[PDB]
Each structure stands twice: as C-alpha cells, then as structure tokens.
Design a protein around this ligand. Structure first.
Ligand code: ADP
Ligand code: ADP
Ligand code: ADP
Ligand code: ADP
Ligand code: ADP
Ligand code: ZN
Ligand code: ZN
Ligand code: ZN
Ligand code: ZN
Lengths: 368, 374, 366, 368, 367
C-alpha cells in the first residue's frame, strides 16, 4: 500500500524513508562502501497499525512483502526454524523484499533455536521489519548491530491524526456531511487506528440494519483536564528542577553514574501529578500508581542498594532484622515526603503556568 | 431451529438479528462498503442454552450449522489446528454457514492450543473477502480469554445471556412440556417461582425427571427432590436492595442499569466501597443477622481500601508510598488505615439505608415480585 | 451377575432398577418422549463392591457389560482412542453398560483430552462409573445427561454384613458351628471384600489341617462401639435442640446466617463434648470435627466479616497485631459454641446415653 | 534350593510353608473352594537374603523360579509392561511357577511405572508372585489389596544364634580350620546381615592367598560396652509397657481413635530409652532422635489437631499469631516434660528390673 | 603401563597388588572356593592420576584395558545401557580384562542413567571393573554392595617426596638442564596434582621453544602460609590426645554418640580457629567448614537429640520466636564452652603445638 494510507506518521514516515530509499537504490549506499541495516523494529500498542506502515514501506519502494507472525514460527522441533530459513530462502528470491515479523515477542523451547535461526539468516547477508507491543520482553541479542539495530516508535493517534484516520476509512463508506469527524476525534482520545476504523464499520453496519450509536458499542470532557493536570505537573517541574532535562514532548495520549541530587529531582517529578491533582481538583486519581511505584523504587534504591540513606547507612540490604526494616521504610517515607513537598510547593507558585498547560493540553493534546 | 424455540431472550434475540440479517442479505452491508463482523461471542452460565440461540440464528437465516467444541481441537501436534482449518475449509463450502465454538475458554488463553488458537485467528481473520462464514462462540468463563480473541473483526461482538427470570422460566417449562405428557394438574407458574435462578436445562431436566418418574408407573414434585425458601428470596432482595439503593444517594456512583435476585478519584473509590457494604447493611437493618453472601462484596471493598493505602497513595497516615515486605510497624499502619476507610464507608452506607429503610424495604418485596427491575 | 449376588442394598438396588428397567424396555420412556440418563455414578469406599452392582444391573437387564478402568486410558490420544474404540464397540452391543472404575483417574496431561473424549462420547448405551474420591471430579462430569444420576453405596451394616458372609460361605465348606451374626457385629464397618477375604483366609487356614478366628488375627472392641456411639450421639442429638440446624437423616457408627454457621460449629463440638460427658476423656476422632468448626470460625472472622473485634475486613498478609485479633476471636467463637453444646448435652445426657447403647445395637437409626 | 540352606528363618520358614504347600497340592485348597493368595511380599533390610527364601520356597515345592528386578521393568514406554506380560505369559507356561520381583519399591510408588504397575496389577488379577522391598512404606496401598501381595512376611537381621548358624553354611564352601570359633564372631558381629557375614568368609578366603585371618578381614570391612548402651534404650522402652495402664506389652525386645491417656503413655514409652541412658550411663545418646521426634509429633497433634491442649484449646491450628505459637510450643514442652518424668520415675523404682534385662539382652539379644 | 610409571603410591600400590595378583593367578583364589571381588573403586581429587594406576594394574598383570567414561553412557534411552552391555560383552571376550569407569559419579546418583546404572549393576553381577570418583558421597549405596565396588582404595595428592619423584618422570620427556632442582619446585608446589606438575614441565618446554624458564611457568599459574596451615591442622590434631572421648588422627597433613563424645568433636572443630589466634593472633577464613560442622552438631544436640538443658527433650526441626531465641542461645553456650576447653588446652601445650607446626612445614605429613 502507500504512505498516503497512513496518517500522523510524518516523523515515523521520514524515519522509514531511509529504509524505502535503501531497498530501491542500494548502489548509493554500496558506493561509499556503507553496510545497510538488515533489521528495523516498530514498537507500539495494539491497533497503531505497525503492520500497515511495513506494507506501505514496501509499497513506496515497490518491493515484495512477506508477512510472517511469531505465533506461526513458534511448531514440533526445528519446523519453525525450517519455516524461518524457508521464508528467508523464498524472500531472498524476491530481493529486494521486506519480511514482516508481527509479535516478535512470540519468538526457551523450540523458539530458542527458531530465534537462533532468525538471528542466523539475519547475519547471513532483504530487510526484516518486526512489530512488538511488549519490547522489554525481547532478548538483547535481537537489538545488536545489524539485527534490529534500527528502532521506530509508533504512538496512539493525537486529535489531528484521529480525525485524519476517520477520513480514510470514511471514503470506504457513504458518510453524509452531517457527521463531523473532528467532533468524534476529540470524543475518542487515545483510541487506536483500528478502534476508529471499527467505529465507522459499526456505524455503517448500524445503518444497513435501519456513528454516535456506534460510540456507545465501545462496551468525560472534565476527565481530559484531570489527565491534563497529571501531565502538566510532571512536565512543568523539568524546567525548575536543576538536575532534570526538559521533556521532549507533553501529551495526554497514553504512552502504554547518577548523583543523589539527580535521583531526588526524578522522585519530585514523579509526584508532579499527585501534586497538580490536588492543587487543581483537590482530590488524587489512581493514575499516580506507576508514578508512586517509580518514586518509591528510586527511594528504596537510594537507601538499600546505593547507600544514599542518612540513617540506614552505606550497607547493601537487597533478609535483615525488623529493626533494620523499620529504618528503611522510614527513610524511604522521608525521602519521598520531602520530594512531594518540593514538588507541591514549586507547582503552587507557578500554579498559573501549570493551569495554562492543562487547558492548552486539553486543546492540543500534545506540545513541546 | 427457530427463535420461537427460545424464551426470555427478546433483547438478546434482537441483538442476534443483526447477525441473521447479515447472513440473509450481505449485499445491503456490502452496499456502503461496510465490513461484517466475522465473530460473535455469547457469554453466560451453564444451561443458559448459548448453543440453542446459535442454532436458532442459523435457523431464522436458513444457514448451515457446524458445532465444534474447544475440547475437540485442544490433540497430538498441529492436529487441532488441522481440525480448525479442516472445519473452516468445509464450513466455507456451505457458506453462508455458522460455526459454533462451545467452551472457547478451552482454546482461549504456550502449548498446542497456542497454534490451534493462532489457527482460529488466521482462519477467522479470513481476509477482505466476504467469505459469508460467521463464527459463534460460548464461554462460561470469559476473563480466561486471550485479548486477541476480542480484537476488531474476531469476536468483536459480545452478547450476554442471563439466567431466566420467573416469566422466562414458566415460558421455558411450557416448551419442553409439549415434548411430554403435561396433565393440567401441574401449574408451571407455581414451579417457575419455586425455582428462581434455575437454568434452561435445569428446568428441562425437571420435566425429564418427571417423565422418567411416570414410566415407573404431582409426580413432578418427587422429581424436584431428586435434584439431590420463599423467605430467602427476601434475604437476597435485601443484599441487592442495599447495593442498588445507594447508587442514587451517592454523588460519585452511577445508578444500576438493573437490580435482580438471580483513572478514579478517592471520592469515586470510596462510594464504591460504601455500595459494596450496602447489602451487608440491609442484611442487619432488615434481618438483624449478616449472611455469607457478603464475601465477594467484602473482598472487593477491602481490595479498593488496600489499593487506596498501598498503591494509589490515598492514605492519610501511611502516606504517598508504594508498599507492594516492610516493617511490622509499617504493616499495622496499613491494616489500621484500611480498617478505618472500610469502617467509615460502612457507616455512611448503614446510615443512608437506615433513613430510606422504607424505600429499601419497598425494593425487597418488589424484587420478590419482578425478580428484576431498572 | 444377579442382584441376588449383592446383599443389604435394597434401597441402592431399587435405585439401580430404574436403569435396569430402561435397558430392558426403552420404548416406554421413548413413548412420552423422555430422555434416558446416559450416565450414572456410584460413590463409595473400596470393597463396597461398586463393580459388583454395575455387573448385576446388566445381569438383571441381560445387557452387554464392558469393564474399563481409568488407570487404562497412554502416550498421546491413545487413551482417547481407547475411549472412542470402547464406545464404538459398546454402541455395537447396545443396549450395553460401560463401567469406568476409578473415574477419579481420568476425572494437566493426556487425561484432559481423554476426559474430553469421555465427555465427547457420552454426549453422542448407559455409562456406569465408581469413584472412592468424588470431590476430585471436574463439575463437567456431573452436567445434565453425563453422570447426571449419582448413587451412594454405604459400608455394610450388621444385617448386610451377616447376609454378605452367607453368600461367599456357600463358595466354601463352613461347618454350622461358626455363626455369621457373631462375626457380623465382631466386624463393624468392614467392607464386602474384607468379609469375603476373611472366609477365604479361613478356608486357606483349614487346608493347612473355629479356624475363622485365627483368620481375623491374620488381618495383622465392644467398648469402643460405645465411644463411637457417644461421638455420633453428641453430633446428632444437637440437631433437634438447635433452632438453625436440620435433624440428621440418619445416625450411624460407620446463603447462611451467622446463627446457622454457629449452630454447625456447636454440632461439630457434639462428639468432643459427649466423649468428656460420658468417658471423661477426648479421642483423636474429633480432628475433622475440630478442623471443620475452626474453618467456619476463621471464615466468620476473615472472609464473612462476622467478627465483632476484627471487623468487616477480608483478610484472606497482615500485621501480627491483626493476626492475634483473628486467633483470639476464632478461639472465643469456638469456645462459646463448645459451651452451648456441652451444656445442652449435660441436660439431655439421659437422652444421649439412650442413643449410645441403641447405636451399639442398631448401628444406624433415623 | 532348600529351606535347610536358610538359617534363623524357622518362623519365616513356617510362614512360607503355606505357600510351598499350595504350589505342591493346589487341589486341597480347591477342595473347600478357597481362592489361593496370588501375591506374597517379603519385607526386610538388605542382606536378609529375601531372594534366598523365595528360591527355597520353589525348591521345597519343586516349582519353576523366574527372578525379575523392579529396575528391569522400570523402560522407554510400555516396553516394561510388555516385559511384565512376557514374563507372566512364559511364567504361566511353567505353572505352578514362582515370580520373584526384587526392589518392588522400584515399580511401586509417574508414567511407565504407572502403566508398568497397572500391568503388574493387571497380570496378578488374572503362578504365585513373590516380592522383596527394603522400603515398604514407599509402596502404593493398591499393591497390598486382596489377592495382590495380600500376604506379607517380615525378615529380621540374624540374631547371635542365626549369625553363628549362617557362618557355618558358607564356611563349608571354604577351608576354615576348626581352630576359628564362629560363636566368637557371631556376637562380635551383632545386627550384621546374612551377606555381610558371608562376605567376611570370602574376604578371609581371599586373605588366605597369603598362603585368626577372619579377624584381619573384620578390620578390612573399613563394642561389647555399646551392647549395654543399646540394652538400656530398649530395656527402658519395653519395661514401661507393663507398668503403664493404656500400653500393650511388646511382642519382643531386641538390640538389633485413641484417648489422651493412650496417647500420653506412648510419649512416656518414647522417653523410656532417653531416661534409662541417664539412669544407667548418666549421659544421653543420639539414638533418642526418632524416639524424641515421635513423642514431639504426638504432643503437637494433641495440642494442634486433636484439641487435647488445656491452654491452647479445642482449635485446629495446622499461619497463626506468634502469641498463639508460643502457647503451642509451651504446652508441647509441658506434655513431654510430664511424660518424661512419669517415665524417669517408673524406671528409677524398677531400675534393678531394668538392669536385669540389660545384661540378659546383651546375652539373649532378643526376648518376650 | 608399569607401577614404576606411578610415584608416591607405595601403600596404594600394595593395596592394588591383591587385584593384580587375582587377574594373574585366579586359581589360587578359586582353590579354597573364594569368590573374587568383581569391583574396585579409586577415590581421589582431580589429577591424582586414578586412571594411571588402573592402567598400571592391568600392566603389572599383563591384562587387557577398556577405558569408558560415565559421561559417554550418560544417551537417548537404553542407548547407554546397550553401550554398557556391549563394553562388558567385548570385555568378557578379552578376559582377564580390566574395565575403567572414570567419573562413576556421572552414572552413579529416575533418568536414563538409572537403567544405565541398573545395566552397570546387572553386568557386574554376571573381568574386574575399576572406577574413579572425585565425589564418592554422590554414589548410590547399591554401587558399594558385596561383589560390586565392595573394595575401595583412596589416592592422596602427592607429598613433597612424591612431587619431586613425579617431576623427574615427565622431565625425561623434555630437555631439562641439571641447573633446575626439582626438590626446589616440589616444596614450591605443595598439594599440587600429578597432572598440575606434569603441565608445569609442558608450560616450561613450551616457553623454551620461544628461545630458569620453569620458574616463569610457576607464575603462569607462600612459604609462610605453610605455617598458617600447619597451625589450623596442629590445633585440630593435638586435641585428640588430650580429649578423652576423641581418637588420635591416623596422620596430620598440610595438603549412637554420647553428649561427651559430640562435645569433644566441637572442641576439635575449634582447634584450628584457636591455634590461628594462639600463634598468628588473627583468625583465617579456612575455619568456615570447621565452624559449620561444630554449629551443626551444636544445633543437633539442642533441636533433635534433646541434649539441651534449657530447650529440653523436644524435637524442634516451625516454632515460636521465643523458642528460637532459646535454641540460638543454648548453641552459643555449648559452642563457646567447647572453644574454651580447646583454646585453653592449646595454650598450655602451645610449645607442643608450635613443634607440630614446624615439623609439618618440613615433613608436610606426620603420624
Ligand atoms: N494510519 C492508520 N490509520 C488508521 N488505522 C490504521 C492506521 N494504521 C493501521 N491502522 C489500523 O490498525 C489495525 C492493524 O494494526 P496493525 O497494523 O496490525 O498493528 P498492531 O501490530 O498494533 O496490531 C487495522 O485495523 C488498521 O485499520
Ligand atoms: N431458551 C431455553 N429454554 C430452556 N432451556 C434452554 C433454552 N436454551 C437452552 N436450554 C437448555 O440448555 C441446555 C444446553 O445449554 P447450552 O446451550 O449448551 O449452553 P451452555 O454452553 O451454558 O451449556 C439444554 O439442556 C437446553 O434444553
Ligand atoms: N454385596 C456384596 N457383598 C459382599 N461383598 C461384596 C459385595 N459387593 C461387592 N463385594 C466385594 O467387593 C469387592 C469388589 O469391590 P468393587 O466392586 O471392585 O468396588 P470398589 O470399586 O470399591 O473396589 C469384591 O471382593 C467383592 O467380593
Ligand atoms: N539365611 C541366610 N544366611 C546367610 N546369608 C544369607 C541368608 N539368606 C541370604 N543371605 C545373603 O543375603 C544376600 C542376598 O540378600 P537378598 O536375598 O538379595 O536380600 P536383599 O533383597 O535384602 O538384598 C547374599 O549375599 C546371601 O549370601
Ligand atoms: N603418579 C603420578 N605422578 C604424576 N602425575 C600423575 C600420576 N598419576 C597420574 N598423573 C597425572 O594425572 C593426570 C590424569 O589424572 P587421572 O588419572 O585422569 O585422574 P583424575 O580422575 O583425577 O583426573 C595426568 O595429567 C597424569 O600426568
Ligand atoms: Zn452484593
Ligand atoms: Zn463426627
Ligand atoms: Zn529406639
Ligand atoms: Zn580444618
């Protein structure tokens, strides 16, 4: 297919071009004697259409496309590895070709040698493209030079990308000018490419039986501000804290050698949503969980592992006395309670600046 | 068979029509260029006759029916997957056809099942092609199912089948009665209420048991006992009355869609905990004693409570700390704050129900009457 | 075999007849359009001759008998193949009876699909099954059609025991000097096979040269019958006096309110009490009685929120202080329920001591 | 072989006769219409020559003998089961025959053995099978059911008399001068095995290759006082059975639904040898371990499971509070410390009666 | 090969002769009707050349030698057992033959090995089998039963004398100038293995081909630490004479029990811990196992054997923390009581202990 079939990929699109450009005219890269990346990995949540982009890459390159899922290869004994080799053998025949390995996470057991085979053909010296919803599950070997050395991240669509996406699948149906897609775009924040595509279908199906009715088959404009505050509080602290680095971007679209002074500023920024959550709404949400968990981990690490604890001391505690335990839990509480204060205070001063970002976020959903 | 062979499904019936309507005239849906759902999942307890409805769908659509159980495919090596493909290959041959996958949980999540299910995925993912084959599935335990199964196209539609009410029960007894000799002496309305929250098959088996008791020589009473009060219906009515009544009075709750006898703010979390304790209260407010039926109600309350303290940092004393081994002192803090948060939420609940007790006691009898209401 | 080969089961016998009657004349049941049970499960201890009855059913019905053990049903699918194979040949000899001894064995591994096959085939001939341990069985086994019928086989009483001895006696040369009624009571709660083996052991002891006494000892008290009589007397007597209990269907020497839960705990403490009230000492036979009481107690406190001190909290992990609360409330609830029990039995002690001796005599009553 | 080749078996010999008598004249047993035991199990330590007796049974009966070890059948998949049937098929051909299954423990407890045993069980249910197990409690209860290994015969380590007798048999197989006295070695080797003794001869005969040599061999296998030490442990145990009301006197004393009152007397007996050791030697041995362990178990059961604890109460404890724990540990200590006293006291009075058994045991080694 | 190819085996050599003598003239043993041992096990650390001696046994007996490793037989299913049978079948063909089973631990520990072992046992029950294990306690009891590996011979790391002797043998295989003294290297390498020494030569011979070179090889791996070790072992051994319920050690090298017996052991376990302080004033880490064993016995006295005053006649091996504190303290009592009797004994006879030390630094072993 075309890159015109994909919307709001712009940066990702240009990132994938260097691959497209390779497959077309490898000679320009062969000219200076420059080895081409064999592997490119697409990381993203389900419905981000990681598959769609892979096809489009081949499309824009007019190159052969061989879709293979990790579920397929992952077979009695060596059958999978045979399928791996087999695929690559036929794939080499249609060179320049693209192989897509959906759920690379899928490929212990026969997978081990299947993976080994996957790694084998790759280093053999055709560009392999892979898609993982859960990338931290991946063996480090997969990311080494040559093999999936390139990595491109696909984000849930923003309001602009959402409306744009609705327009593409809309053409596949007869949509009266009465329905506004910008209205639904915002109505569905952090929805997936496929989620939206299915909404249209659901409506189109509802019509023939006889898009708002379809929204309801998903089984608040205020909660968008609530989220706006969690993210506002997080991001705002990066400028004011010395040992932080300003956020590359601030979004309300789900993203589904360090000094004590550096460690602590992080903990403060983790509390920047527990903060603005009261500063603004006076109540805390459950969305702090991971924010609290990360803070607490760093805190525990300071005390137990890094010996940055005043009371507990320069000891590695990672089975000890209950007395020793109470010491840790207490120093952890302090470090955290301090960092929350410094955070609550900073945001209270610049509250006007924070409340600015909130609505701006409820508007643009994303900014830098 | 017919939708006329099924009782107490009217809403479910209308829900299944959109499938029936597809199989008949796919062109109407192909007109605007609208992709048809490939998969439709029926969720319900055993005996709810999830199978019955699936047949009737094909019946009303005059379509081919291929029953396959998850237990079948779930086989040496790839044999199951072969059976999956095999079924779909022959199923494509009788298009428009319906495939029924009873106990989808059996193949729904690794092992042979993994590729067997990976297979179901590929088979049903058919392609842009119409195919005109719709997969129907029935699961007693749906939370066991792999997320992949519920993705767009594949079992994207989900229809929930409820244990029959008093009306559906009597209606059901009448259908299987015709299959036997029913003396005008047996009243089915009497048995209908006598058997609240019984299953379509449970009732159907009662008839059989009677029919069997006959051949050994009213008699349907002796059969009731071979399954081995009207007061307990009020007891249940109180648990559910207490639960539901609180939804109106609590700001951060949403009124219950129905009441039957068959990113969240602290303020939202707490109201839930109160509602959980609801029936625990009405149980004393009305009967002065508590039942064991609170277990899950208590468990869920306590979970939310623990989450507030430990994970969400919504605890006053414990603080904004993530506690998921720590000091016993730290433990006592959690157990104590959890106890408070719960004891509070129970009070707010017990108090509310005490005032509107007359309104709650209204629902009780009304529940013993309608068994279900909005 | 015949139902005449089985003794002291009239009730079980008459329960199995409805199956026998089906196999003979299915048409009468087909007339009114009544589906016949495909599965019937026999639950009982080892030696209760669950197998014997299954044969006899076919016997009295003159029907084909296919014995298959759960232990039999294997590499991969082989067991399932054997399942299918059996049912295929079994369908050929219809009306036939299939007996699945140790259904527990097939009721994870190949068993799963073997079971699935068992279920599969049944859904498609009456299958009979025997389990010593029925709680191990998947609920699926008991669904309508498939083992929907369940019949419980009890260890033989004094009458059934004597009757049983007489049947295997005919298989040997036992002088009229040996009285089987004497041995019947001498062996309370012995199994059909246990008794049958005693005869054999004697018959064997004879050939080496009344002798049946020497055989009793090669198993390598009339007072202990009263001890048991007290445990069961105490248990049963409380059912009448306690409001929220239901009287016991039988007494042998073989959606719940707080108020209902507590009465049970009291009943559990029945035999514990009576042992002291009568013998002044407690036996070890209280274990399960204590365990069940304690479970209910714990459940009241931890899960059901029926604890005064502990509160409406789900504790099923927590501070030691929170633990001590549970252990203490549990102890109270139990110690209370024992008292209410000990007290009741003390008053009606004369009524309890009545049942005791009567039990040493009738062994079972209602 | 003959029963005359086995020594100190007399009781075991008479026990095995009923089997011998069957194999000879099965008609006598067929006369009264008596089904014959298909299985007979021999239980004993290694070297008790469980195998020897099995052969001799066939010998005295002039019957065919088929030795098969559990280790053999225990065989890829079904191979062993086929071997089971194969043996039984050929065994039925030589009927009346005896099959000996050494290390029945090997086939008697996951897969092959499950079917293997099923097969063993299957074939038996269908020739008398004889089996030998050093560890019988490892065996599945199914093995002991009526017909299948329903008979059980226990073989004891040879006493002083059996020892001397045994030495004499293997002596004939060598050139042992009448100067060496076997009664001297018999007592010198208490609780030695039939094979242990037989090996001593061999080792001596091997030493004779250099050309009171049997003494040098005793040492190459790498106390008259310790015999009294043991005599005291066993004296203390046995003596208590007469004096305690709720006990039953020991069937034998060698140096090779229960009431609280019954439970407690046991605990006292368990403490018997622990006491006598102090009363006589003033010191305790380590040989109390199992004696202590069993006492403590009964004690724990009284408190935790049977509700026979005064302080702890009628509660089933088998996770609880530390306070609840301390209660159990303390009640257990009392119950034991009491039962030890009652024991220590009893033995102190009848010390002269206990000291009597001591030497009598160091003499007769066994008594009733 | 020859027994002359092996050095410092003297006692082991004479121990192996009875095997050699059998294989040569079996009739002498068959004369009186005496069954011959089928199995003989060699127990020793790696490099003790357990293999070397096995060959030499056959050599001095002019008998066939069939080397088979446990790693070999240890195969799909029954494959190894077939290899076992095959070996013994062909081995029977070259009778009188010797079979050597290196790493018997590999087949001696169910799995394929179980039936492979069973086959090993089976075949032996039916040629003398010789086996070598570095870890003998891993071995199934069945292996040691009468006939099957009923004989056991222990092979020791070479002493200073055996070391020098060993160096001389592999020296002949190379061009070693009379300038290098092997007695110098012998002591320089205490508790080194037959192969370790042999490899030193090689390493030197390799260093030569690039061209007192044997010294550079030493480094491609302290005379004071010999005294440190001498003290740990001096303290251990010296206590055996003075303690009533002990038995003196057969030798001292630098390479149903009464309470009274148990306790003396604990004191002995503390010997080296003491002597290190009495002499060097500091304790080493080499006490670990010495402490561990002491503590185990201590714990056993209290918990299992009911030899504890405070804890009582109770079997404790899940209990209250209060009950725990009682145990941990009875132990520190017994343990410190023991270390004391010991520390004192060694303080008095310190002059006797300091003697054994130097004698040890010299003799490396003594009786
Ligand atoms: N640019 C896009 N706009 C809209 N929908 C898209 C886009 N890209 C992909 N999709 C949708 O995503 C779904 C497929 O996602 P896929 O490519 O398989 O990624 P994933 O690996 O996350 O499932 C399809 O339903 C497709 O319509
Ligand atoms: N509408 C109905 N009324 C009465 N009984 C019904 C109805 N639908 C199904 N049943 C009964 O349900 C049983 C089968 O349930 P099934 O369709 O298999 O659902 P499940 O998957 O829960 O077992 C049969 O005994 C049938 O008689
Ligand atoms: N009615 C009976 N009277 C006496 N013995 C009986 C009777 N029924 C069965 N038995 C005995 O029970 C044994 C078989 O029990 P079985 O039928 O296999 O049941 P289980 O499954 O409990 O083993 C045989 O020894 C047989 O003699
Ligand atoms: N009566 C006996 N007297 C002496 N030795 C005996 C006797 N019976 C057997 N043995 C010895 O026992 C050993 C074999 O024991 P075995 O019969 O296999 O029993 P186990 O199963 O305990 O090993 C042989 O060495 C044999 O000499
Ligand atoms: N007497 C000896 N003197 C010196 N080296 C020896 C001697 N015996 C064996 N070795 C050495 O031991 C090594 C082999 O040890 P080996 O016989 O396999 O015993 P292990 O089983 O401990 O490895 C060889 O390098 C050999 O040179
Ligand atoms: Zn509820
Ligand atoms: Zn009871
Ligand atoms: Zn003992
Ligand atoms: Zn040491």
């Amino acid at each position: 297919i075309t890159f015109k079939d994909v919307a709001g990929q712009e940066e990702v699109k240009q990132e994938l071009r260097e691959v497209v450009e390779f497959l077309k005219n490898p000679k320009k890269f062969e000219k200076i004697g420059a080895k081409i990346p064999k592997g490119v990995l697409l990381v993203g949540s389900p419905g981000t259409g990681k598959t769609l982009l892979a096809k489009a890459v081949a499309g824009e390159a007019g190159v052969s496309f061989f879709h293979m899922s990790g579920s397929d290869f992952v077979m009695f004994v060596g059958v999978g590895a045979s399928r791996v080799r087999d695929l690559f053998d036929n794939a080499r025949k249609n060179s320049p070709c693209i192989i897509f390995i959906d759920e690379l996470d899928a490929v212990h057991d026969e997978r081990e040698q299947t993976l080994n085979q996957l790694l084998v053909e790759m280093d053999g010296f055709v560009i392999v493209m892979a898609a993982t919803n859960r990338p931290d599950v991946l063996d480090s070997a997969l990311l080494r030079p040559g093999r999936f050395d390139r990595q491109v991240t696909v984000s849930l669509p923003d309001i602009k990308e959402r409306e744009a996406i609705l327009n593409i699948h809309s053409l596949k149906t007869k949509l009266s000018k009465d329905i506004n897609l910008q209205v639904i775009a915002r109505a569905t924040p952090g929805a997936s490419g496929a989620d939206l595509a299915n909404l249209i279908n659901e409506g189109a199906l509802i019509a023939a039986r006889n898009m708002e009715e379809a929204r309801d088959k998903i089984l608040t404009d205020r909660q968008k501000l609530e989220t706006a505050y969690h993210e506002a509080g997080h991001a705002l602290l990066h400028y004011y804290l010395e040992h932080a680095d300003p956020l590359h971007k601030v979004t309300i679209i789900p993203r589904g050698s360090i000094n004590k002074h550096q460690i602590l500023d992080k903990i403060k920024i983790c509390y920047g949503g527990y903060a603005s959550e009261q500063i603004n709404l006076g109540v805390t949400t459950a969305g702090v969980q991971n924010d609290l968990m990360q803070a607490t981990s760093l805190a525990k690490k300071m005390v137990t592992e890094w010996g940055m604890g005043e009371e507990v001391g320069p000891i590695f505690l990672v089975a000890y006395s209950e007395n020793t335990a109470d010491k840790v839990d207490r120093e952890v509480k302090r470090i955290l309670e301090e960092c929350l204060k410094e955070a609550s205070d900073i945001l209270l001063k610049h509250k006007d600046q924070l409340v600015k970002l909130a609505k701006e976020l409820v508007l643009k959903e994303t900014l830098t």
